[PDB]
Amino acid sequence: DRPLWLPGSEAPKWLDGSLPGDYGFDPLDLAAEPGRLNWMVQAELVHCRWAMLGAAGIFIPELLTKIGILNTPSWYKAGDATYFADQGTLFIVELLLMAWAESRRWADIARPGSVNTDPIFPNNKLTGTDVGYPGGLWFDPLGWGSGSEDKLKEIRTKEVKNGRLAMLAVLGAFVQANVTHVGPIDNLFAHLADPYHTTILQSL
Amino acid sequence: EWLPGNPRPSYLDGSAPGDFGFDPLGLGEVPENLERFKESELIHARWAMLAIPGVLIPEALGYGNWVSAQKWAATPGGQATYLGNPVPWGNLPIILAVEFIAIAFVESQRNGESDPEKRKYPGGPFDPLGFSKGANLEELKLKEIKNGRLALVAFLGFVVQAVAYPGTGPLENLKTHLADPWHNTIAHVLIP
Amino acid sequence: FASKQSLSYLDGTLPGDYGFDPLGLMDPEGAGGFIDPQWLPYAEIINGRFAMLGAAGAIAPEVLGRIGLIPQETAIPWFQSGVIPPVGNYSYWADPYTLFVLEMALMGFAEHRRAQDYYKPGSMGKQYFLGLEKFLGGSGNPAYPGGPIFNFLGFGKNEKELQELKVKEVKNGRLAMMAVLGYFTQAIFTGVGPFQNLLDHLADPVHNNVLTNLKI
Amino acid sequence: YIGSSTNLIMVASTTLMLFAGRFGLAPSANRKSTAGLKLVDRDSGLQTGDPAGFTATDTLACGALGHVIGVGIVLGLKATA
Ligand SMILES: CC(/C=C/C=C(C)/C=C/[C@@]12O[C@]1(C)C[C@@H](O)CC2(C)C)=C\C=C\C=C(C)\C=C\C=C(C)\C=C\[C@@]12O[C@]1(C)C[C@@H](O)CC2(C)C
Ligand SMILES: CC1=C(/C=C/C(C)=C/C=C/C(C)=C/C=C/C=C(C)/C=C/C=C(C)/C=C/C2=C(C)CCCC2(C)C)C(C)(C)CCC1
Ligand SMILES: CCCCCCCCCCCCO[C@H]1O[C@H](CO)[C@@H](O[C@H]2O[C@H](CO)[C@@H](O)[C@H](O)[C@H]2O)[C@H](O)[C@H]1O
Numbered sequence: 001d002r003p004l005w006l007p008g009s010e011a012p013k014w015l016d017g018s019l020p021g022d023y024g025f026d027p028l029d030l031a032a033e034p035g036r037l038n039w040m041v042q043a044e045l046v047h048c049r050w051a052m053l054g055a056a057g058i059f060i061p062e063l064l065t066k067i068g069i070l071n072t073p074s075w076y077k078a079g080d081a082t083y084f085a086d087q088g089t090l091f092i093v094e095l096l097l098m099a100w101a102e103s104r105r106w107a108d109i110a111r112p113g114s115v116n117t118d119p120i121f122p123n124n125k126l127t128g129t130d131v132g133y134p135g136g137l138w139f140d141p142l143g144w145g146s147g148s149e150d151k152l153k154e155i156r157t158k159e160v161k162n163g164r165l166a167m168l169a170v171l172g173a174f175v176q177a178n179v180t181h182v183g184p185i186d187n188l189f190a191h192l193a194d195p196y197h198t199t200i201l202q203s204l
Numbered sequence: 205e206w207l208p209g210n211p212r213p214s215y216l217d218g219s220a221p222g223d224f225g226f227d228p229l230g231l232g233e234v235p236e237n238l239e240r241f242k243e244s245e246l247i248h249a250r251w252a253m254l255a256i257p258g259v260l261i262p263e264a265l266g267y268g269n270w271v272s273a274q275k276w277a278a279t280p281g282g283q284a285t286y287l288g289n290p291v292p293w294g295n296l297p298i299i300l301a302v303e304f305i306a307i308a309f310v311e312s313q314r315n316g317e318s319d320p321e322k323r324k325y326p327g328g329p330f331d332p333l334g335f336s337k338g339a340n341l342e343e344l345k346l347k348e349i350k351n352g353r354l355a356l357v358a359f360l361g362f363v364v365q366a367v368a369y370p371g372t373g374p375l376e377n378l379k380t381h382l383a384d385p386w387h388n389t390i391a392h393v394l395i396p
Numbered sequence: 397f398a399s400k401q402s403l404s405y406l407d408g409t410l411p412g413d414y415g416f417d418p419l420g421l422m423d424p425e426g427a428g429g430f431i432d433p434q435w436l437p438y439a440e441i442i443n444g445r446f447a448m449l450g451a452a453g454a455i456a457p458e459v460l461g462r463i464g465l466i467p468q469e470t471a472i473p474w475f476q477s478g479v480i481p482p483v484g485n486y487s488y489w490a491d492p493y494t495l496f497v498l499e500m501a502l503m504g505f506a507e508h509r510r511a512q513d514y515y516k517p518g519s520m521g522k523q524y525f526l527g528l529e530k531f532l533g534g535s536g537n538p539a540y541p542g543g544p545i546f547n548f549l550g551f552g553k554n555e556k557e558l559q560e561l562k563v564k565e566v567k568n569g570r571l572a573m574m575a576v577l578g579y580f581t582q583a584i585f586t587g588v589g590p591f592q593n594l595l596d597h598l599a600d601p602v603h604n605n606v607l608t609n610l611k612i
Numbered sequence: 613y614i615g616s617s618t619n620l621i622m623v624a625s626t627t628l629m630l631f632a633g634r635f636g637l638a639p640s641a642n643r644k645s646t647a648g649l650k651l652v653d654r655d656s657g658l659q660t661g662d663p664a665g666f667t668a669t670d671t672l673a674c675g676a677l678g679h680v681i682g683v684g685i686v687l688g689l690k691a692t693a
Contacts, residue, residue: 084386085386085387086386086387086391086392087391087395088391088392088394088395089386089387089389089391090386091391091395092389092390092391092394107207107208107209110209111209111210114208114209115208115209117208119208229548229549230550231544231548234530236530237530237531237544240527240530400658400659401657401658401659402659
């Protein structure tokens with residue numbers, strides 16, 4: 001009684017549908033391995049969350065600049081721009097901080113509920129009871145979302161499909177920067193100016 | 205607890221000083237091999253501990269560094285004029301022979317110690333102050349091994365930095381990192 | 397299971413055994429000297445491992461130079477590094493004969509020790525080496541010593557995976573032996589590196605083969 | 613050179629020698645000739661995939677004899693014609 005991504009299409013046996021967003025869409029038969037499904041769901045969560053973060057960080061500056069509130073440079077040349085700190089130094093700081101963060105995440109994934117305790121101050125005790133959703137004061141301050149059964153399903157579906165939308169949108173933005181030398185919203189303006197003569201087939 | 209949540213090895217349960225269940229490659233399966241590795245790690249670390257002040261202090265006062273010592277620091281001639289006021293003492297025939305003979309003698313006398321427990325810790329007839337009994341033994345060993353591991357990694361950093369920058373020292377590197385924190389670090393050589 | 401007759405002594409227990417022995421060199425009827433059936437598999441494995449090293453190391457510098465990892469002063473072909481001074485020469489920190497003496501010393505230690513372990517299986521772990529005699533007692537088969545140094549990661553813990561690894565080793569070794577022979581012959585005929593030969597056969601396959609290079 | 617007369621003579625000689633080898637028109641490893649040139653059968657401990665008994669030894673021998681005859685014919689024709 002669960003809608004499928006394709007009407008009248010039989011869902012894969014392993015794709016039960018209990019997990020949020022499971023619409024029986026696995027054409028490549030990739031997730032049939034017993035040990036791969038958890039890795040797939042965690043990877044999709046991380047991918048969608050970082051993709052939507054990057055989607056905000058890309059779309060908001062260009063939109064604000066074209067409105068007029070801000071006067072920030074574009075994303076596809078920001079790396080080659082004047083900064084107080086050297087680019088390599090910043091990158092090393094980034095990789096170190098992310099090494100700590102993901103190391104914690106990887107330890108959580110491999111060993112369930114093993115790194116919920118803060119070493120320096122053992123009086124924190126993260127509250128998350130599911131892998132990939134640690135919650136806690138640092139990551140879930142207000143406490144929204146956590147409720148009864150079938151309440152988490154709809155909001156997690158919202159999260160995963162919003163992340164999918166943002167991820168495909170950011171792929172589109174990168175493809176734009178590869179094909180046109182201007183921001184995607186300016187391409188929206190161009191598509192609005194002459195819609196029947198401005199599309200993908202026009203200047204492929 | 206080098207990584208929380210990871211099972212400890214069966215032989216590495218956390219009884220000896222400095223144990224944190226860290227042996228991913230599995231070289232300590234044999235208890236005697238584990239003892240030999242303990243002795244070797246402690247020796248490497250203790251030598252690094254002894255050497256580190258002797259290479260930071262001269263630069264702190266402004267004497268020399270790795271390239272200066274290895275190329276010309278009165279070492280190949282001049283009859284040891286390096287130490288503030290020139291003192292003759294010895295030269296190439298002496299500072300090239302007595303050191304090697306003394307180190308060979310001490311290594312041979314250490315090799316002639318039967319007890320592995322004394323091999324990992326000399327203990328007896330050595331201590332002038334006799335502070336081994338005064339303080340807790342386990343705490344003293346833990347502090348010694350932790351400072352020794354810090355000294356070992358610090359000395360590896362000294363060697364790598366000296367190789368990366370000829371004719372330089374750790375203290376000037378520290379000054380450069382203090383004065384220009386975001387333009388002189390690992391990045392200048394990771395991304396040249 | 398392939399190649400020629402099943403010689404009735406190549407039953408199949410050896411890794412890589414396919415009953416290929418047209419000359420009957422491994423017949424155990426008269427089997428003295430270096431034609432002993434316990435010496436030929438070991439010798440095959442040894443020229444094979446050395447050939448794997450040689451093929452990888454003779455093709456690596458030129459590829460790295462083409463990509464750009466190493467300075468182009470060191471991207472010379474394998475025969476222009478000092479093996480054959482009349483063809484080409486490179487200046488290292490020592491003249492090649494001092495290098496040869498040092499190499500012979502180190503390889504003499506290693507190889508005479510390995511030989512003594514082959515001839516006296518339990519030895520090399522009894523007398524006092526400089527502390528390393530504990531890890532240098534080869535377990536069982538001379539060609540597969542193992543231990544905390546020669547197998548320091550722990551592959552082939554079970555028997556079947558070890559059999560697969562042995563078979564893989566034998567095939568890559570035989571392939572590398574043939575590759576090294578090809579390196580030699582192609583160096584003689586073409587006068588350029590094997591990677592350049594590969595690029596030449598790829599650019600114009602019909603006009604850049606052995607039939608064209610008959611004139612040097 | 614591929615269509616040249618020398619190439620044709622060499623390929624024809626080698627092919628004819630191999631044909632006379634595989635089919636019982638010439639001596640081979642598994643088919644001995646007697647004093648009367650009769651081609652009796654001989655059993656050799658050589659295993660081959662060819663169902664007619666043609667082995668790699670026969671392939672090498674027939675190819676060698678074919679190259680020899682072809683070279684002789686080519687040189688003779690060049691010298692005369
Ligand atoms: C060891 C070896 C190669 C070693 C190469 C090395 C170390 C290369 C080193 C260097 O290049 C570097 C890295 C860098 C350079 O700058 C310098 C040098 C120093 C040049 C090849 C062996 C190569 C060994 C070969 C090719 C052996 C071939 C054997 C065959 C074909 C046997 C066939 C049969 O024996 C059977 C199987 C069954 C029998 O019954 C019948 C017959 C037919 C007899
Ligand atoms: C597998 C297969 C097959 C086959 C194929 C083929 C193609 C074959 C061929 C083969 C061949 C084709 C072979 C050949 C060989 C040859 C040879 C072996 C030769 C040699 C030569 C020589 C020996 C010479 C010498 C000399 C002289 C005498 C003169 C002078 C000079 C010199 C010295 C050089 C069959 C059909 C069965 C099936 C299918 C697949
Ligand atoms: C049995 C031996 C098996 C293994 C053989 C290994 C290959 C040995 C032959 C190498 C063939 C390459 O040799 C070919 O290139 C060499 C380098 O460009 C040339 O060498 C020439 O040029 C070099 C570089 O300018 C000069 O240093 C030489 O003095 C000069 O002779 C040879 O004149 C040429 O014949």
